């Protein structure tokens, strides 16, 4: 007989690393906004694989692209050309209006690529002496699990026990233009990297004008503005890029997640020639980066986001969702924040009542969500959700919260 949910749990515990403690639910199927476990139970997905399935689970067009390409050609490596990569590159660089794209697989690789680009540009264009180039980050940032990524982190669970740490990474508070100015007084600073909204920190939305400030502060000090839109980009927040809300053009744009609809690890780094061309042949790459299969999947995913106008959907439905969430009692839900379909609530955590328990009961009532720490619950359903479905999921969130 097929394994039960408990069987799945014990098997992963026995033969898999304990680097996660996931919400006890064992899914075997997913489609659109919905997930199904081995017992056949139906659930709303309100995490969307950290925006990777903005298009919903197993969106037919992207599945068709994957299936059509998998029979033809999947991996030539970059020692030779394949026929798809140039097509994808032209499409995506004209969609976001940058000169060039460097393809990688995972989001952390896009971040690493951005850091290498920043340092090369600093040494070779800005004249920073080797090796004194600094990159500034914002506290609460998350951009991966490599040693470099955790070296920028202020979250002890990311970095504790994994040092020594990468030099040249300065940290300043988020949503703090004066701190950024002070930091950008150092001429050896090559770049400032920042999330338009801090996802894993708990959907931290900075104040209006922060992004435009950052653009101005980077421009005035000859510092590269790196926007990590891996979670916030691709329709999730109600625009194609979150930075669009303030009409800001970063120097480097990081893409991932929804770039494939969950079908293939594809990330992208976008920038103009004066930054991209600092890296010469043989100095950077990846085995699977830019393989034809991922490129087909990515073209399809981006087409889906454009054709179904998922950005406008996310904007309208996020308005509705936050409105309904504000009606929860302030004595139990202390805050609701977000943009588009990236939202979170903060609950008045107690010794006995926390966000984990809330997510357990939400699961019990057919809605899957992720708690950050003990007091933050993310609400981020796929952008294909309908209003009638969004309501009903809201009705589950209510009832669950007011059950405690
Ligand atoms: C803004 C932002 N940029 C970059 C990244 C890095 O993306 P990778 O594909 O996990 O390396 C993230 C990582 N997201 C992680 C959640 C999934 C998990 O840890 O299991 C992010 O949030």
Numbering used by the authors: 36 to 439
What did the study's authors say about this model?
For GABA, an intermediate formed that exhibited a covalent linkage with PLP and was detached from the catalytic Lys292, a structure consistent with the proposed external aldimine intermediate. The carboxylate group of the ligand formed two hydrogen bonds with Tyr55 instead of interacting with Arg180, which is proposed to interact with the carboxylate of l-Orn. No other interactions were observed between the ligand and the active-site residues. For two monomer copies in an asymmetric unit, the Glu235–Arg413 salt bridge that is a key feature in the holo-hOAT was found partially disrupted: the side chain of Arg413 moved away from Glu235 and Gln266. It is possible that the salt bridge could be broken during the first half-reaction to prepare the enzyme for the second half-reaction. Considering the exceedingly slow reaction rate, relatively short soaking time, and good fit of the model into the observed electron density, it can be concluded that the species observed in the structure is not a final adduct but rather an external aldimine intermediate. However, considering the transient-state data, the external aldimine appears to be the most probable reaction intermediate to be observed in the crystal structure. By contrast, the external aldimine is free from Lys292 and is distanced 3.4 Å from its ε-amino group.
In the first half-reaction, PLP and l-Orn are converted to pyridoxamine phosphate (PMP) and l-glutamate-γ-semialdehyde (l-GSA). l-GSA is then prone to cyclize to Δ1-pyrroline-5-carboxylate (P5C). In the second half-reaction, hOAT catalyzes the transfer of the amino group of PMP to an α-keto acid, preferentially α-KG, forming glutamate and regenerating the PLP form of the cofactor.
